[PDB]
Amino acid sequence: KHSLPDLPYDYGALEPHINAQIMQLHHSKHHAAYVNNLNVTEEKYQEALAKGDVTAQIALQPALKFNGGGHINHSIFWTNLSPNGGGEPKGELLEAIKRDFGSFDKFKEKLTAASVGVQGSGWGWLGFNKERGHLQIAACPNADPLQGTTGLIPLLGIDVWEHAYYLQYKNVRPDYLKAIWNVINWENVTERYMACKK
Amino acid sequence: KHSLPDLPYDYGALEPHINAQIMQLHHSKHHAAYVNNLNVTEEKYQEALAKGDVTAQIALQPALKFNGGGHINHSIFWTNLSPNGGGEPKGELLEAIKRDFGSFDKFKEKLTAASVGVQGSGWGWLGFNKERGHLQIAACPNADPLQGTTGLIPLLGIDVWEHAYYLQYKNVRPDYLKAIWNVINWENVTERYMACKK
Amino acid sequence: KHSLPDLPYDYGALEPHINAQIMQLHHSKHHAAYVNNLNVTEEKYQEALAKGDVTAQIALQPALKFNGGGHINHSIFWTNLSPNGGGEPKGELLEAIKRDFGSFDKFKEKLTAASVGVQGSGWGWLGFNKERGHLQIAACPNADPLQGTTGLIPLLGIDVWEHAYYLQYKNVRPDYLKAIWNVINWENVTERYMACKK
Amino acid sequence: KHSLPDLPYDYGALEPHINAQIMQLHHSKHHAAYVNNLNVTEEKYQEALAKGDVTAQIALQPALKFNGGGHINHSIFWTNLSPNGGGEPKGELLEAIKRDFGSFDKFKEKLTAASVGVQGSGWGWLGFNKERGHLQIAACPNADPLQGTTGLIPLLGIDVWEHAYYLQYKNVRPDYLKAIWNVINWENVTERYMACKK
Ligand SMILES: [Mn+2]
Ligand SMILES: [Mn+2]
Ligand SMILES: [Mn+2]
Ligand SMILES: [Mn+2]
C-alpha cells in the first residue's frame, strides 16, 4: 500500500513564494487522491494480471500512469522544496551544472524555459542521464513521471499544472517560476544527484 | 487577422455559477493570448510555406494547433454560455438528444462524465457526426479543437482546464460541472445543431 | 501463460488473396514473437507490482501494450479469415450494416478507406459500440488493441502493417485491401456480433 | 514545388546489403508518393492560411507532417548511403563519436539498438544537439522528421519501416541493421557534422 507522505514542513512554511492555501490543497487534496486512486488501480491490475486479461491490463494503463505518476512526482516535489531553500547548490552538483549548462543562471533560465513552455498540464525536470553521465533538462506532460517515461533520474521537478500556482499567480506562470527558485531545497537535489554517483 | 471577440454579456453575468474573476481572466488574459500568439504563428507559417521550409512548418504545428485551438474553443465556449441559460433544449435538438442518449438527463451525465474524466487539461464536447448523422460526445486534450482533430461539428463545449474553475471550485471539478449546466445557452447550441441540418 | 494459437487452416488456404509465405511468416514469426515477449513483460510486471515499483510498472507499459495488443489482434485476425470466406454476411449482421452504413458496399468503402488511410503501422476495425448499440468503424495505430483502447468490441480486423501484405502487394496496399474481402469469414464476424448484442 | 531527387547511385549499387528491388521501390514509389502528397497538402494549406481557416490548417497537420517528413527523411537517407561506403569515419567526427559514445563500436551498438527498438514504423538517428554541442542518438515514429520534432540536426538516419527491408530480410530487422553498416556514406555524415559544428 503506497501512502501519502507528510510534508517536511508546514503548509505556510513557503510563504510568500507559494501561499498556504495552495500547499494545503495540493498536498491534502491532489496528492491524496493520486495515492488512493493508485492503490485502487494496482488492485484492479493484479486481478487482471492474475486472469491473463490483457485487454483489462491495457485499459488500466492510463489510470496507472496518471495516478502512479501523480504519486511519484509530488512525493519528489515536496522534498525538492524547503522554507530554507533558495540560493545555489555547491560542490559536484554545482560543477556539473556549470559544465552542462554553462552556469547556474543559464541552467535556471533553461529549466524555467522548459517549464513555462509546457502547453497544458505538466512538469519541468532537471534529471540525470545515467548512460551519458550528465545532467539533462526535460518536460513531461500531465502526470507522466520522468524516470518511468524517459529513463532519466529526477533531481528537481517544477510542477506547472495550473493547480500549482493559479490561486496565487493566476495566468502568469512566469511569476510562479520566478518565485519558486526561492524555496528550492538544493540540499535534497544534491542528495539525489550524489545518489547517481554510485 | 483573427481577433478577440467581445463576450456576449458582462463578466459577472454568470454569477454565482462562474464568478466574474474567472470570466474576466479567462477572456481578457487566456483567450487574448491565444489570438495574438495565433496571429504570430500564422505569420511565421506563411514565411515557412513561401520558402518551402518543411522543417519549419512541422516545428510550428504545436504552436498553431495550441493557439489556433485555443481561439476556436473559447470563441465557441462564450457563445455556449448565457446569463439566461440553463433548462433544456427543445424541438429537434431535444429529440436528437433523447434519441442518441436515451434522455436529456442521461446526456448530461455522459457529457459530465467525459469532462470530469479528462486527465490533465482539456475539453468535453457534444458534437455532430455528419457521416453518421447523429450526436456524439468526445473529449479533447489540451487546446486541440474538436472539428480540426475529429471531424465532428462542435455544438456545446465544456472547458475543464483548471483555469476555467479552480479559483472558485478548487480541485472539485464535479462542483464546477454541476454548476455550469445552469448557464448553458441552449438557444445557441440549437442554432449550431440546426446549422448541420443543411 | 499465453500461447500462440494454431491457425484454423493451412498456411496456403487463403491463396491467392494472401499468399502462403506471408501467412506462415505472419503466424510463426510475428504472432509467435508477440506471445513470447508478452509472457516476458507480464512476468516482469508481476514482480514490479508485487514490489510496489510504480516506475517499473509505467516503464513496462509500452512493451505490455505492444506485445499484448499484438497477441490480441492477430488471434482475432486469424479467425476473421477463411478459405471458404468472401461474399456477404446475412441476417442481423447484414441488417445492422446496411442500417449503420447505408449498405454493404458503403461499408466496404468505409472500412477500406479507414484501413488504407492508416499512416504507418496499424489496423482498421469494424467494431460494436455497446453504449450506442450500433456498429462503428475505427483505426488503431501500431499494435494497440481495439477494446483495450476504445472500448469497442472487435468484429472484423484488417491488418495494414506492411509485413501483412508487402511481400505480395509491395507498396500497393489498396490491392491488398481489395483482395482480402474474398477471404473474410463472415460466419465468425457474425458470431462476434451476436455475442455482444445479447 | 517540391521534387523527388535522383538517387546518387544505381538502384543495385548497394548490393548485396540492400537489394535493387527495395531500392527501386523505396525511391520510385515510396519517396515519390511523399513528394506528390506533400505538394498537394502544402497547396491546400496555402489556401487555408489565406482564408484564416484554422480548423482546416489543423486538420491538414497530420498529412503535412507525414508526407513532409517522408520527403525530408528519405532525401537525407539516400545521401547517407554509398556503394563505396562502410568502414569507419575519420577526424573530428570519429573523435566526437568515441567521445560521446565511448567508442565507434559502442556507437554502432547504441544506434542499432535504438533502430531495432522501434515499435511499429520509424527511424533511428544519429544527430547533433547544437544546444549541448554534442552528438545524440534518437528514434522517431512513423515519418516524423528529426529536426522538425526534436531540434536535433540529422547526421545519419536508419529507416526501419518494414518496406525498407522486408522483401530481403523479412521479419529479421537485426540482420538488416547489421548489413547497412557496409554502405554508410561516412563522407556525407562528416559533411553534415562539420556543417553544423561551424
Ligand atoms: Mn501538482
Ligand atoms: Mn480555457
Ligand atoms: Mn500483423
Ligand atoms: Mn522508407
From Swiss-Prot, chains A, B, C, D:
Catalysed transformations (reactions): 2 superoxide + 2 H(+) = H2O2 + O2
Induction, as annotated: Expression is regulated by KRIT1.
Organism superkingdom: Eukaryota
Xref: InterPro entries: Fe/Mn_Superoxide_Dismutase, Mn/Fe_SOD, Mn/Fe_SOD_BS, Mn/Fe_SOD_C, Mn/Fe_SOD_N, Mn/Fe_SOD_N_sf, SOD_C_sf
Any single GO BP term: negative regulation of fat cell differentiation
A molecular function GO annotation: identical protein binding
Residues modified to N6-succinyllysine: 44, 51, 98, 106
Binding site for Mn(2+): 26, 74, 159, 163
Record's keyword terms, sorted: Acetylation, Manganese, Metal-binding, Mitochondrion, Nitration, Oxidoreductase, Transit peptide, Ubl conjugation
Cofactor(s) of this protein: Mn(2+)
Tagged with keyword Metal-binding: yes
Subcellular location field: Mitochondrion matrix
GO cellular component, one term: mitochondrial matrix
Ranges that cross the membrane: none
Entry annotated with the keyword Oxidoreductase: yes
Post-translational modification: Nitrated under oxidative stress. Nitration coupled with oxidation inhibits the catalytic activity.
Entry's EC annotation: 1.15.1.1
UniProt cofactor note: Binds 1 Mn(2+) ion per subunit.
Positions of modified residues (3'-nitrotyrosine): 34
Residues bearing PTM N6-acetyllysine: 44, 51, 90, 98, 106, 178
Family: Belongs to the iron/manganese superoxide dismutase family.
Medical condition linked: Microvascular complications of diabetes 6: Pathological conditions that develop in numerous tissues and organs as a consequence of diabetes mellitus. They include diabetic retinopathy, diabetic nephropathy leading to end-stage renal disease, and diabetic neuropathy. Diabetic retinopathy remains the major cause of new-onset blindness among diabetic adults. It is characterized by vascular permeability and increased tissue ischemia and angiogenesis.
Subunit structure, interactors included: Homotetramer.
Function: Destroys superoxide anion radicals which are normally produced within the cells and which are toxic to biological systems.
Record PANTHER family: SUPEROXIDE DISMUTASE 2, SUPEROXIDE DISMUTASE [MN], MITOCHONDRIAL
Name the record gives this protein: Superoxide dismutase [Mn], mitochondrial
